[PDB]
Amino acid sequence: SVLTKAIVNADAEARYLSPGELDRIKSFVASGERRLRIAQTLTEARERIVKQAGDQLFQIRPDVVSPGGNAYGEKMTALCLRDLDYYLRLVTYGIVAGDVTPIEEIGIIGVKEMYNSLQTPIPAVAEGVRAMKNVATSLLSGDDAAEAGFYFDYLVGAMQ
Amino acid sequence: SVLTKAIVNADAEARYLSPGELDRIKSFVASGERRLRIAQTLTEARERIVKQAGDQLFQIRPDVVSPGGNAYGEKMTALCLRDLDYYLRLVTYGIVAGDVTPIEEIGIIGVKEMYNSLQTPIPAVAEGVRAMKNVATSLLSGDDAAEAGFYFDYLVGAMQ
Amino acid sequence: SVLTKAIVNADAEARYLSPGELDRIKSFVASGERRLRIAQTLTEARERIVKQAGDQLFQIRPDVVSPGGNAYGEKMTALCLRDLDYYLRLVTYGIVAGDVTPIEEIGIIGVKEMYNSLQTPIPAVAEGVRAMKNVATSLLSGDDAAEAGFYFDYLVGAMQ
Amino acid sequence: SVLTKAIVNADAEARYLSPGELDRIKSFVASGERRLRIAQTLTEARERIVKQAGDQLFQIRPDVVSPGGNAYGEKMTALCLRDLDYYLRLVTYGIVAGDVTPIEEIGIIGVKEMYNSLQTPIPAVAEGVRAMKNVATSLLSGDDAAEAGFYFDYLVGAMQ
Amino acid sequence: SVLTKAIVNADAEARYLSPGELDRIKSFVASGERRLRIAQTLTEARERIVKQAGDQLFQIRPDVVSPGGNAYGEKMTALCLRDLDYYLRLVTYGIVAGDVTPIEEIGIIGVKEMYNSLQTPIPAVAEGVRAMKNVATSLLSGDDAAEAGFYFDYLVGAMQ
Amino acid sequence: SVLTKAIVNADAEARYLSPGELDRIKSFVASGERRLRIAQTLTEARERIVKQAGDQLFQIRPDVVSPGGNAYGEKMTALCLRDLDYYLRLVTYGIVAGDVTPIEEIGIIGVKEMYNSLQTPIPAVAEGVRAMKNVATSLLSGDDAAEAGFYFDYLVGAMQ
Amino acid sequence: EDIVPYRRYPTLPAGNYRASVRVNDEELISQSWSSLSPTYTGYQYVTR
Amino acid sequence: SRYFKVTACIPSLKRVRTGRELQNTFFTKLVPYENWFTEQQRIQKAGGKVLSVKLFTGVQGANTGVGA
Amino acid sequence: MQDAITAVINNYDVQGKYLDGAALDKLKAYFTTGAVRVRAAAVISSNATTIIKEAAAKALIYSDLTRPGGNMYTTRRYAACIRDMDYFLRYATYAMLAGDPSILDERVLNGLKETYNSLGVPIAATVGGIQAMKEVVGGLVGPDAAKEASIYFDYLSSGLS
Amino acid sequence: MQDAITAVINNYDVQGKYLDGAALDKLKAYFTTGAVRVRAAAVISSNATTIIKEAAAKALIYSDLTRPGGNMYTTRRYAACIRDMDYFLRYATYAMLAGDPSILDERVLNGLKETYNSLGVPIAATVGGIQAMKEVVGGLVGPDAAKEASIYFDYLSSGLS
Amino acid sequence: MQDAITAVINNYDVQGKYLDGAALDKLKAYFTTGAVRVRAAAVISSNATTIIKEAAAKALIYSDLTRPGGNMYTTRRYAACIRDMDYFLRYATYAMLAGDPSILDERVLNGLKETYNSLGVPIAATVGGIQAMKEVVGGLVGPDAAKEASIYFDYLSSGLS
Amino acid sequence: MQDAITAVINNYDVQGKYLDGAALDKLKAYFTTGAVRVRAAAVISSNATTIIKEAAAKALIYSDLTRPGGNMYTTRRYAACIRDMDYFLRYATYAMLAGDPSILDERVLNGLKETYNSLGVPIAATVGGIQAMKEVVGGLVGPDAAKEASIYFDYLSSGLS
Ligand SMILES: CCC1=C(C)/C(=C/C2=NC(=C\c3[nH]c(/C=C4\NC(=O)[C@H](C)[C@H]4CC)c(C)c3CCC(=O)O)/C(CCC(=O)O)=C2C)NC1=O
Ligand SMILES: CCC1=C(C)/C(=C/C2=NC(=C\c3[nH]c(/C=C4\NC(=O)[C@H](C)[C@H]4CC)c(C)c3CCC(=O)O)/C(CCC(=O)O)=C2C)NC1=O
Ligand SMILES: CCC1=C(C)/C(=C/C2=NC(=C\c3[nH]c(/C=C4\NC(=O)[C@H](C)[C@H]4CC)c(C)c3CCC(=O)O)/C(CCC(=O)O)=C2C)NC1=O
Ligand SMILES: CCC1=C(C)/C(=C/C2=NC(=C\c3[nH]c(/C=C4\NC(=O)[C@H](C)[C@H]4CC)c(C)c3CCC(=O)O)/C(CCC(=O)O)=C2C)NC1=O
Ligand SMILES: CCC1=C(C)/C(=C/C2=NC(=C\c3[nH]c(/C=C4\NC(=O)[C@H](C)[C@H]4CC)c(C)c3CCC(=O)O)/C(CCC(=O)O)=C2C)NC1=O
Ligand SMILES: CCC1=C(C)/C(=C/C2=NC(=C\c3[nH]c(/C=C4\NC(=O)[C@H](C)[C@H]4CC)c(C)c3CCC(=O)O)/C(CCC(=O)O)=C2C)NC1=O
Ligand SMILES: CCC1=C(C)/C(=C/C2=NC(=C\c3[nH]c(/C=C4\NC(=O)[C@H](C)[C@H]4CC)c(C)c3CCC(=O)O)/C(CCC(=O)O)=C2C)NC1=O
Numbered sequence A, B, C, D, E, F: 001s002v003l004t005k006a007i008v009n010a011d012a013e014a015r016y017l018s019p020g021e022l023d024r025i026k027s028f029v030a031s032g033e034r035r036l037r038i039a040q041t042l043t044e045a046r047e048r049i050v051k052q053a054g055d056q057l058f059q060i061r062p063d064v065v066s067p068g069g070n071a072y073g074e075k076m077t078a079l080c081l082r083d084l085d086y087y088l089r090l091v092t093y094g095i096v097a098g099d100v101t102p103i104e105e106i107g108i109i110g111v112k113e114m115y116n117s118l119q120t121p122i123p124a125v126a127e128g129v130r131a132m133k134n135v136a137t138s139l140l141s142g143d144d145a146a147e148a149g150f151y152f153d154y155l156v157g158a159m160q
Numbered sequence G: 001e002d003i004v005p006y007r008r009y010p011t012l013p014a015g016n017y018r019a020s021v022r023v024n025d026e027e028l029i030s031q032s033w034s035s036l037s038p039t040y041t042g043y044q045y046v047t048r
Numbered sequence H: 001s002r003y004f005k006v007t008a009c010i011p012s013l014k015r016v017r018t019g020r021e022l023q024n025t026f027f028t029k030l031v032p033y034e035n036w037f038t039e040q041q042r043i044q045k046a047g048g049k050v051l052s053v054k055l056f057t058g059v060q061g062a063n064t065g066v067g068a
Numbered sequence I, J, K, L: 001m002q003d004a005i006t007a008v009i010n011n012y013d014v015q016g017k018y019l020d021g022a023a024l025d026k027l028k029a030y031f032t033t034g035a036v037r038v039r040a041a042a043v044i045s046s047n048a049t050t051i052i053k054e055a056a057a058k059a060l061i062y063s064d065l066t067r068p069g070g071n072m073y074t075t076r077r078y079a080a081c082i083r084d085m086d087y088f089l090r091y092a093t094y095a096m097l098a099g100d101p102s103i104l105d106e107r108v109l110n111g112l113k114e115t116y117n118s119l120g121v122p123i124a125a126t127v128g129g130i131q132a133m134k135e136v137v138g139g140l141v142g143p144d145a146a147k148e149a150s151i152y153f154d155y156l157s158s159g160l161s
Helices: A002-012 A019-030 A032-044 A047-060 A076-098 A101-107 A110-119 A122-137 A144-156 B002-012 B019-030 B030-042 B046-060 B074-097 B103-106 B113-116 B122-137 B140-158 C001-013 C020-044 C046-060 C074-097 C101-107 C109-119 C121-138 C142-158 D004-010 D019-030 D031-046 D046-060 D074-097 D101-107 D111-118 D122-139 D143-160 E002-012 E019-031 E031-045 E046-060 E074-097 E100-106 E111-118 E122-138 E142-158 F002-013 F022-044 F046-060 F074-097 F102-105 F111-118 F122-137 F142-158 G018-021 H036-044 I006-015 I021-046 I049-058 I075-096 I104-107 I113-120 I122-139 I146-160 J005-015 J019-032 J034-059 J074-098 J102-109 J112-119 J123-141 J146-160 K003-013 K021-030 K034-059 K076-098 K100-111 K112-117 K122-139 K146-160 L004-013 L021-031 L034-059 L075-098 L101-110 L112-119 L123-141 L147-158
Strands: H003-011 H026-032 H049-052
Touching: A002 A019, A002 K146, A019 A032, A032 A047, A032 A076, A032 A144, A047 A076, A047 A122, A076 A122, A076 A144, A101 A144, A101 H049, A101 I075, A110 A122, A110 I049, A122 A144, A144 B140, B002 B019, B002 B030, B002 C020, B002 C121, B002 K003, B002 K076, B002 K100, B019 B030, B019 C020, B019 C142, B019 K021, B019 K034, B030 B046, B030 B074, B030 B140, B030 D111, B030 K021, B046 B074, B046 B122, B074 B122, B074 B140, B074 K003, B074 K021, B103 B140, B103 K003, B103 L112, B113 B122, B122 B140, B140 I021, C001 C020, C001 I006, C001 I075, C020 C074, C020 C142, C020 I021, C046 C074, C046 C121, C074 C101, C074 C121, C074 C142, C074 I006, C101 C142, C101 I006, C101 J074, C109 C121, C109 J074, C109 L123, C121 C142, C142 K146, D004 D019, D004 L004, D004 L075, D004 L101, D019 D031, D019 E142, D019 L034, D031 D046, D031 D074, D031 D143, D031 L021, D046 D074, D046 D122, D046 I049, D074 D101, D074 D122, D074 D143, D074 L004, D074 L147, D101 D143, D101 K076, D101 L004, D111 D122, D111 K076, D122 D143, D143 E019, D143 J034, E002 E019, E002 J102, E019 E031, E019 J034, E031 E046, E031 E074, E031 E142, E031 J019, E031 K076, E046 E074, E046 E122, E074 E100, E074 E122, E074 J005, E100 E142, E100 J005, E111 E122, E111 K100, E142 L034, F022 F046, F022 F074, F022 F142, F046 F074, F046 F122, F046 H026, F046 K112, F074 F102, F074 F122, F074 I021, F074 J074, F102 F122, F102 I146, F111 F122, F111 J074, F122 F142, H003 H036, H003 I113, H026 I113, H036 H049, I006 I021, I021 I049, I021 I122, I021 I146, I049 I075, I049 I122, I075 I104, I075 I122, I075 I146, I104 I113, I104 I146, I113 I122, I113 I146, I122 I146, J005 J019, J034 J074, J034 J123, J034 J146, J074 J102, J074 J123, J074 J146, J112 J123, J112 J146, J112 K112, J123 J146, K003 K021, K034 K076, K034 K122, K034 K146, K076 K100, K076 K122, K076 K146, K100 K146, K100 L101, K112 K122, K112 K146, K122 K146, L004 L021, L034 L075, L034 L123, L034 L147, L075 L101, L075 L147, L101 L112, L101 L147, L112 L147, L123 L147
Parallel strands: none
Antiparallel strands: H003 H026, H003 H049
16 A cells, blocks of 8 residues: 555664655545545446457457457457456556555566466557556546546556 | 687686586587588578578468568568578577577577567567478488577577 | 586576587587496506506605605505595596596595695695506507596696 | 784774773883894894704705705705795794784785795795794793794794 | 683684784783782772762762753662662773673663663763762772773763 | 967957957857866866876886986985976966966976986976876866866977 | 675666776776785896 | 574565575575574565574573673 | 486495496496487477466466465466476476486475475475476477486476475 | 683673672682693694694594595595584684683584584594594693693583584 | 687677678688697696796796895785786686687786786786796697697787787 | 884885894884873773864854855764764874874775865865864873874875865
């Protein structure tokens, strides 16, 4: 969180939290209910976001659902959208934590190696997350859609 | 060479070459006139091994020469056949040196980062490199074909 | 051996054995049959090599078999030839492996400290080894005599 | 000196001198005139001392001065006494300094490597120094002879 | 002690004691009976010394014994003289050891942190020690008074 | 200076100065602040520059400080560094003015005749100046070091 | 815990690559550590 | 003159390093008393597990002969 | 470490024996397989990534292991696991070249059982990952080399259990 | 570590006692033997190498220990063994100067029994190497110092057994 | 560093040329002298110490250099000088094996001239120490190798002057 | 570093001379002032903190130096400055004990002028801080030692200017 990242700095210098550190915890926690609303909206539309992301992805790059494609077939496709469902979940976690610690340990450190092993185009995959952001950004009112959008763009950022 | 590799170990342990190290330089240099001769067959047929490789490569994986393919078009293909020409050249260098020092600094260290940037599909490239082995090997005697084959399989090994 | 030396360096760069650090092994395998044969030949004449080495030594350095000499007396001379028998044995080991390896651990690392304690003149031990080279080398074909000679000159080198 | 040694330890621990360190400087400096007298007496008899050391040496080891001896001959013996003159000089330096810093940098660090190259038998150099102790010590009062003797036994110790 | 200090330096450089180190052990041990007499005299007058230090202190700093002073009151003053009794004891230990090892581990390393916590003014503790020097020194011969004085000035130094 | 040189050429022609000549002077004025600063910097380290120049000189030309050398001895060497101090001073003058002018009148016109009389080897004075360039130049930024370097190379040039 | 240290030439901190090239493997150790007997310097030559 | 004899297991959790590393993570080492407070903190701030500790060298008593 | 040849040399050195006749039979065998061990080693190397992309598929992934709560859940741990797999493959290739398992003890097995217990790494699942790579290897290397490669994978797997 | 003198200081420090008559008597009993300890150390140091050689000759070499199969076979291990011997001699000389065995526990005995069990180093044979160096030492140092040097060699040897 | 085999590759790589006939001829000219280089290195290595001893005896010691005021006065500096000598011998042996002087520039000559000027180390005297070791080397290695060893000693010595 | 005594030993060593009358006279001139040097060091050490405080008070603080824009503005830099002051005092005390300034060159002055130019540290102001500590020192140590302490403070200050 902001807490985990910051306290760590306190303990490492053998000291209590600074006025600054205390202030940011206060400003952060004040921005809580809003962040929780952003996660709720997106949790509530997860199935729509994933599939519409999946259509947006395969138009922008179909070849993956073709004879020599990594996601070719019904159960090779059932896995690609499942991975898109995984990353949307991690994005909701990140938004409520206010940083990436959780997103990072769960789904980027070791990935690139992971995707590479399986031979999936990494840029294919970031389209798909970028596509999920669009469907989801549209089930939220203008203020909440932006707050959600930061976490989508983070995942898009990390995967590359 | 074998030397560049057979001396570096000497200097790093602050010592003169071992009987073993001296012996291999001996055996290596005795195989010189012959190693030179295996690398001359391959320059003869430089553009014909490459053309033939190109075809095999695209049967086993065509999609690269298709609308959304990295090598789609006449000059996106000219570049691809050109990269195959590059690696055959490096393979002739390696064979006459008796190790990979030259092959490595010129065309594998940094190759992941280069091709990831270009989003050339690297793993297709390994298969393309493999095809050249098949063609080149059919223009060499059994004994010379094996000696050549080790260097082809090295690039295939690195490359991925 | 040649194997041990190659491998130990390999694991050191987290790498696979390359096309050079394979050629030496192949040379060694062919060499090993010849190498095994030379060791057997040396083993057959061991008593003659030691004894004639011991005469050649005491002519060239009569001081070690004199009042204030380390090898003065019948049983101070008996142990001296036994040490010459030890080193000939280690030389057969070195030849067969193709790499000196085990001989170093068995009879040069620590040898200065051992002999300094016993007060044995090291450089006259080096002479005893040259003397063995001369005898052993006269029981081997030109090519095999040279191959053997490298290992004799190594021991002579390490006692220095 | 005693000063140099005390200070170097002080500076290395970033501190002023200890009561102990101050005390030894005081006891040392009180012995100044006495130490200077000990050096004078020995400087005054230098030519006699080396010689009597040189006689004591050649009786005990007539071999060094024998066919295969490092000091065999008139000018191989002349250099040998010159080396004995060198070490007596360094011993006078040590006595007036109250430690070995000077003795050490000038004539023991590197001495093994020097004499091994020249093939000089080190332990018979140690004997030449004992021989000088015996002569020098017979020209000094009991108390001064002991104080001198520590520095002779140090050199004897370092050649070991 | 002088022994501990000499040895620790010896062992840390993997060597026997130096002529210097041996000399100081000899001079030190010769002063044994004298050093023991210096400790006895001071042990014999401990109650008087602490008191006269305590008077000298409260004249020079009547504030420490004032409303906002660390030693204000009858039992805040009782503990203060007890601390003065502690340090006189450690000074007797140091004098018989011939260095500070014991004085240091028992009562200076950590003393800043201890007294900062208790909010004791360190420099006025240093004054209490000067005051003890003045009293103790008036019960010792000139020569013994100086020898004692070094250890008092050390403690004064370490609280700094 | 740059001023003196420009004017003298103007007056010789008996016509007022030009308007692109009013360009070199303008450049010099801006340059002068930087030029003044470089001279001050050189002046600050004068003793270090001279001394280190003097070591660099006597290594490169030990013959001048040898039996038949112009600078042989302690006070023949003292005057030699004093001459090196003279020329560094003149170099600071030259830099500041922007034109060499005064240095020529002070220390090159007549210098052959002076040193020939004293029998001073001129080309080794030129070396002493190169040595000063090397030291001085290591205390200046790249741009300022070059600007300074022109004046050092001039003096080196004039002693020729 | 267990890698024996080696020379580095690291790219990153800015200026550090060239400083590193210079400190190690470009400029060696001068100055004799001990202060005991200065080297005289007037004798470069070994004629005989 | 007091050496503790600790044992830990630290698991890399930020990088997936690619060569070796077995001994880097599961190891026994006497570490001197002066530094053991920091080494323990360093093991703990990396999510390490401190399995064992011992006094090893020093007496577990103190005051004179400890802080040498 | 030791190989076939140094195993024999050190066994005789401790007795101070020159190599005798039966010992020399043993060295003859190692030079007879030296060609196949080298050709075989090469094949594995360049096909490594392909090989590893078949052992995981038949023994690790598509399972609870890769799902939340599983030890190879997270890209971090998936990466660590196939990293390990590469170690095993690579070292087994060393052992088989050397014709001696001693390197598998010195540089792979020592402490590994407890390391895995301490992290929670599932031992039985790791053994299946080893015995699946063996299965693939034995197909690729052919009759010549199948039995010889196989044993050092079996050495690895009974070293954990 | 501690010596005679700091042994007493720390024993009183934990009671917070100024040194009393009993303490002062102990310290005298040390100081009064001090000059003799120094002379003895100078003999041992300057004969170090000869003591090891005569001790090895009486108690270690010319034996199965130095033959193939023996723990001091190989120049490597022979060197390690007489290296050890030098440690013992050198530290015993420290203990005897200090008049306290505490250094022999802190820097020599702690863990050494098990270290030797783990390497296979023969304990009984090492004790004989210690008690042979004592024998030589006791001749060289003379009546003055013989008993005092001897005890720290005996401390070393009952520390292993 | 580079060697004859490696230099041919990097010299062509910068031109992007396959190895052609001229290149292949150069590499042959190296391989064909290779066995002789190895034998020569084994002679130098095993006579290392004697070469330094005979080279110092002909070109350095018995002189003002080893006397007070001389740069190889003091056991410290005598040791440093013959230490240096061993470097030269050892690296020249590397250069001759590689058939390329580039290592002598990268790891020996770079900055050495000024290092010697800064310490006061006599350059001319050091060159004689190099050319004396060459003289000895050329006797020991024989007709086969004499000219080839010699050049890298000559490379070293014109690198200082 | 060197002191009075080793200055003489090394000056004679390079000539390979035994110490003669002139040398012996120099060493006496040091020993004869030795007890006074020790007493002076004990005064300086034990008044260290007060000397810095009185020297700063006369020559540094209550000024533009301690105000915004000044080099000893900020607790950080004020701390660094009086830290430096302690170095000077402490090393000058070493130089005066040794009776040789060589330590002030080796461990204090070398590069310091340029270090101060690079950070912006005011040189003239630092010299006044040195010459104020000298003033205080000369009062505290008395007639016996005043001139001898003073010179190494003067060595320090002409080393910067
Ligand atoms: C010797 C080491 C080395 C290599 C290998 C190298 C490759 C390289 N390939 C390039 C382009 C290219 N390379 C390819 C290659 C391919 N397209 C495909 O789909 C296939 C997978 C593949 C052919 C097998 C293509 C299509 C381009 C053009 C890409 C572009 O212009 O965006 C370029 C940029 C064009 C140029 O300026 O030359 C470089 C530098 N450069 C080097 O220094
Ligand atoms: C050179 C010899 C060598 C080996 C073999 C080795 C293994 C090894 N595996 C580790 C962790 C691990 N090993 C695995 C392995 C697996 N996960 C599974 O679920 C599967 C059953 C299995 C793969 C088939 C995982 C997931 C971790 C990470 C544990 C953690 O999160 O801390 C670690 C801890 C340090 C690190 O994380 O890198 C080591 C040292 N280290 C070595 O030095
Ligand atoms: C929460 C952290 C986390 C992630 C993300 C994760 C992904 C993951 N993706 C997998 C497969 C896959 N993933 C994909 C995904 C794609 N194919 C494409 O071409 C596209 C680029 C992309 C969809 C956007 C495909 C096609 C497979 C099947 C590959 C195969 O079976 O070889 C598998 C192996 C199947 C399984 O056992 O579950 C895992 C573990 N595991 C994790 O623990
Ligand atoms: C395999 C490795 C290895 C070696 C080489 C070895 C040598 C060795 N040589 C010994 C003695 C000896 N070695 C010699 C040898 C010589 N005298 C001379 O003057 C000549 C220079 C030289 C004969 C060429 C002599 C004379 C002794 C008896 C010395 C004594 O008893 O003091 C001893 C002690 C006696 C014993 O217990 O065996 C050992 C252990 N031990 C080993 O483990
Ligand atoms: C002050 C520090 C210092 C020392 C000690 C020193 C010694 C020294 N001894 C030498 C030779 C020698 N030294 C000796 C000495 C001996 N021969 C024996 O057998 C006896 C064991 C011993 C006499 C006790 C002999 C015989 C030579 C001639 C060796 C030769 O020329 O090969 C040489 C070479 C000749 C020369 O150029 O001077 C040096 C430099 N150099 C130094 O800078
Ligand atoms: C790996 C490549 C390499 C080389 C070659 C090398 C040379 C080298 N020689 C040095 C000193 C030296 N070199 C010599 C050499 C000689 N004295 C003489 O009078 C003779 C003319 C000559 C021997 C033939 C001496 C005497 C010193 C010591 C100078 C001093 O006292 O500081 C030093 C200074 C550091 C030190 O003292 O070790 C270096 C770095 N360093 C390297 O890293
Ligand atoms: C912006 C960062 C900064 C601070 C804070 C700072 C403080 C500072 N306080 C000073 C003195 C002082 N400061 C105090 C303060 C106090 N006396 C007490 O008893 C109270 C506890 C406290 C008031 C709350 C006193 C009494 C002096 C005079 C001390 C003396 O002259 O010896 C001085 C020396 C006088 C001078 O030259 O200005 C400085 C530099 N300097 C800085 O650069």
